From Swiss-Prot:
Protein name per UniProt: Met-enkephalin
Portion of the full-length sequence here: 100 to 104 of 267
Post-translational modification: Processed and degraded by ACE.
Domain of life, per lineage: Eukaryota
Annotated function: Neuropeptide that competes with and mimic the effects of opiate drugs. They play a role in a number of physiologic functions, including pain perception and responses to stress.
Length: 5
């Protein structure tokens, strides 16, 4: 995760 989707 991290904020790509």
């Amino acid at each position: 995760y991290g904020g790509f989707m």
